[PDB]
Every structure is written in C-alpha cells, then in structure tokens.
Amino acid sequence: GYRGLQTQAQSAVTAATQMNNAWDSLTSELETLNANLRKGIIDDSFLRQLFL
Amino acid sequence: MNDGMNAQSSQALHIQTYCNSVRQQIPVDFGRFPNLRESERQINTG
Amino acid sequence: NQSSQALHIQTYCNSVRQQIPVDFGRFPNLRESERQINTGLGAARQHAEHYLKDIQPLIIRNVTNIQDYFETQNLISTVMPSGATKEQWLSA
Amino acid sequence: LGMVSDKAKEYQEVSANTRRTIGSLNDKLIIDSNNYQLIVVNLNNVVNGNNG
C-alpha cells in the first residue's frame, strides 16, 4: 500500500515539476514583453515599432 | 543556436529529474548501533 | 511510436553522458574490469560530445544549404526560356 | 502602452507567486514520498528478519 502511495507521489512530483516549468516560462515570456514594451516607450520613430 | 538550446533543454530535464530523485533519498538511523552515532549524524548532514 | 535516426543517436548520446564511473574497490577480482569499463565509458562520452556539439549540427547546416540551393534551382529550363540570349542561358 | 506594461508587471508578479505555491507543493509531495519509502524499507527489513 505504502509502495503504491510512494509511486503516486513520485508521479505527482513530475506533474508538479512540469507545472513549475510552465509558470516559469509564462513569467519569462511576460518579462520579455515588459522589456520589449519599456524600450519602445523610450524610443521615438522606427526603433519603437521594432520593439513593439 | 537551435543545437545548443535543445541539448541544454534535455540536459536540464535529466538534472531536474536527478534533483527531485535525490530529494526523495530518505535518511537512515543506526539508532540500534551505539558505535555508529557519529556515522548517522555525518550521513544525515551530508 | 518509430524515431528519426538523429533523435535515436541524440537519445543514446545524452544517455551515455549520464553513465557514471563505478569503483569495484571492495571486489579484488573486478579491479581490471572497473578500470577497463571506466576508460571505455570515458571514450564513449568523448564520441557523444563530438556527435552532439559538432556532427549533428554540421550535418543539419550542409543539408539546409542544399535545401535552399535546390529550392532556388527547382527545375532545369531544358528549352531556351522566353526573351534570352543563348549565351545568357549557357552562363546561368 | 504604459497601462498595458503596468498590468503585465502585476501579472508577472502573480505568475512568480503561483510558481512559489507549486514549489511548496513539490516539497510537500517530495517529503511525503520520502517518508513513504522510509516506512517501506523499515517494513521490508522487519519481514526479511522475521523470515530468518
């Protein structure tokens, strides 16, 4: 029974690690958009449209 | 760039797996052995 | 379910990288075995790093260039095409 | 754009928060699985002695 529970937890660990990577990716993607945005506000003409 | 990013991505998952696996490594207690008091603590710390 | 040739090697490569060195130090009869194994494992690792870091990438590059080339030169103009000199066709 | 940037920043912070939650969940599961394994080994030892 404990052995079966241990397997269930091991799988849940993989599932959780996956969810952690997913959120980490979303967080990074947001940071990139933020950086892309910020550099476009302190840009006037063509370099603004590039970052945008 | 693609070759380096991919190789790092498989490499990372391999370490990520090894990491969580080591976390599951349970501590052992030589509590029955009086002479292995230091051994148990040393092992636990490591 | 079957893998591409490259992916099969790519998997085998990373797998060999994970091959840990063993010490049969407790076993006196396995002394030569352990050293031999360790050495062979080390060499295999070298083969993989090369395959991964250089070989597969270089192969991809050459193929890509070839792909781009044939893309541009998709079909041979067997006949003198419309409004060109014979010399122009010969040069091309 | 500035408004959108601010909103994204808040969303980014929220994403980091969710990740932390996941991290805690991971640790909790890891600890559970480990304790389970420890019980299994303790039990295995009992039956492996008892059978001598």
UniProtKB/TrEMBL annotation, chain C:
Name of the protein in its database record: HBL/NHE enterotoxin family protein
